[PDB]
């Protein structure tokens, strides 16, 4: 399509890259100040709360005023947030920057989604939601990698990258973006429940493990963010490529729910092995293989959501994004709390939550059979 769609997709890719940027460089940031894991999780958690809280208000402002102005205002706010986060000294000025970045993201995303809905044809809507989910997942995976790439030269420079990219996106959006009783009962509240719970548990577990891995490596291996980000993004690309290339064979002999139940089973058994893992290469390999399952769960979940929606793919995308943010905020606070209380309590929570997802899928299958 036209470059106006490329710019709109970039406006979200960069936002989710900024979402994922903090995790790799976080240990040094809150260890040179000497802060307990609670605040380490609370940073990303507050970002997610800001995003979710401003999402409906951001959409309302986009509707009542205009999509272009809201989009450029949000890009400006995100750029300011990323420039300010690197010039921070204490916890409060960093949490404030994360909150501002979250509100910018949550008031940009509805505007971009509305613009894409208004520019795209009526038939390329499910496909456009597919690209939306793909770009969001790619940003989630790729954020920490860009963080750890030049987290080496200095510990303020990745946020310089984020701010510069935000300014660039704002200047492309300024010159390219131009302006042109049965409402709630359609959802039965009994068909989307299973995919909603499944995407919630997926996002919760993934965010919790992403938060916990850096803390575990910092407190046990005493290593730099470089290969932490390298391992996280390597697991991400491995899982994404594996699924995107072998889904033809996956769909041949497996169903959807069976796939995303055996995924949790594989993840939980590998995490149990991770409990036994205490060596450098051992923990590296076990984290690499753990991330694969969490990364490959998501495509099946969004495919299930698309199949269930059928014609309401906008509703499916909105629900998926909202519950992804729900998981991404519920996770980090509890992960930091358990890491404060015990170094393997987050792992025990993760395996228990994976088993909860397993039994949820099992009861859904039983209900379908009945």
């Amino acid at each position: 399509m036209n470059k106006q769609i490329f710019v709109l997709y970039f406006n979200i890719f960069l936002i989710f890259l900024g979402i994922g940027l903090v995790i790799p460089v976080l240990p040094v940031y809150l260890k040179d100040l000497g802060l307990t894991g609670s605040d380490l999780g609370l940073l990303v958690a507050a970002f997610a709360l800001s995003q979710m809280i401003i999402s409906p208000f951001g959409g309302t402002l986009a509707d009542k005023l205009g999509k272009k102005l809201i989009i450029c205002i949000g890009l400006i706010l995100f750029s300011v947030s990323e420039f300010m986060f690197a010039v921070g000294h204490n916890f409060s000025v960093l949490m404030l920057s994360r909150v501002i970045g979250g509100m910018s993201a949550g008031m940009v995303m509805p505007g971009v989604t509305g613009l894409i809905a208004d520019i795209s044809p009526s038939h390329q809507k499910a496909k456009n939601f597919g690209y939306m989910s793909a770009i969001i997942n790619s940003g989630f995976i790729l954020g920490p990698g860009i963080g750890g790439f030049m987290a080496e030269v200095s510990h303020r420079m990745p946020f310089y990258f984020a701010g510069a990219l935000g300014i660039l996106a704002f200047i492309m959006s300024i010159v390219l973006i131009h302006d042109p009783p049965q409402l709630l009962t359609k959802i039965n509240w009994k068909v989307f429940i299973t995919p909603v719970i499944l995407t919630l548990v997926l996002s919760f577990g993934l965010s919790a493990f992403e938060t916990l891995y850096s803390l575990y490596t910092a407190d046990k291996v005493n290593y730099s963010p470089k290969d932490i980000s390298i391992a996280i993004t390597g697991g991400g690309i491995f899982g994404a490529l594996f699924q995107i290339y072998f889904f033809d064979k996956f769909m041949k002999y497996f169903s959807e729910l069976t796939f995303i139940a055996w995924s949790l089973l594989y993840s939980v058994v590998v995490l149990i092995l991770l409990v036994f893992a205490n060596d450098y290469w051992s923990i590296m390999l076990i984290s690499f293989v753990v991330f694969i399952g969490f990364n490959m769960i998501r495509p099946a979940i969004t495919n299930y959501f698309s199949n269930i929606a059928g014609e309401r793919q906008g509703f499916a995308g909105g629900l998926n994004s909202t519950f992804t943010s729900m998981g991404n905020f519920i996770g980090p606070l509890i992960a930091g709390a358990l890491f404060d209380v015990h170094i393997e309590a987050p792992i025990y929570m993760a395996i228990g939550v994976s088993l909860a997802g397993v039994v949820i899928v099992l009861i859904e299958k039983q209900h379908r059979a009945k």
Partner: antibody
Amino acid sequence: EVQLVESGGGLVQPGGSLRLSCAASGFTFSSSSIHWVRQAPGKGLEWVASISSSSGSTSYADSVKGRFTISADTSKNTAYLQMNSLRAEDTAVYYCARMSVENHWYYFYWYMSPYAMDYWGQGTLVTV
Amino acid sequence: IQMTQSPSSLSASVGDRVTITCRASQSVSSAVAWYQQKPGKAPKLLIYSASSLYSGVPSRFSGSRSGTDFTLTISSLQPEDFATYYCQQSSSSLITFGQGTKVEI
């Protein structure tokens, strides 16, 4: 207020061509889609074509797939229907209506505007 | 997606209850609309959803859905209602009208 005016029609030689146009006024052309329906004498209506100005997506009925071309220029707020082949079944009174397509933001998701043919202009007549 | 509208003709007096059914084979979405047309004029919008009511339309008109059958109900009739009422569904880019219910008062 809002009104739609159409031009063209009249005696047409079989297999000939005619440019049927709809003039728009009173509404936002780029936030709406102009559709064309057909009314045979003493028969029922049937949708013929549709063009969305906000996205450039055009739709044609199965009986008319690949024989009538529709277009709309935003500069003068006009809607064009190009006829390339006419016949006995094509004689009718052709109407021009406006289909409102603008996303409205319910919280957490955008919903399309309900489908409706709100404003209809007094259609012209095409014979033979 | 063809839709059958039953019946074709429906004579009626004033102040009665008249119902018209237009059945859609693939009915999963409530994208149904109804139009009133007078002889020698253009059709005007009557209903634009399953059970909605456009502004400037008398309140006596109503719509409903049951699985696949779409019902238009005129609870009270007046001489003005002498007209032909058509059904339309636009679930996709393709639009297909009904056959027509020419009521004779």
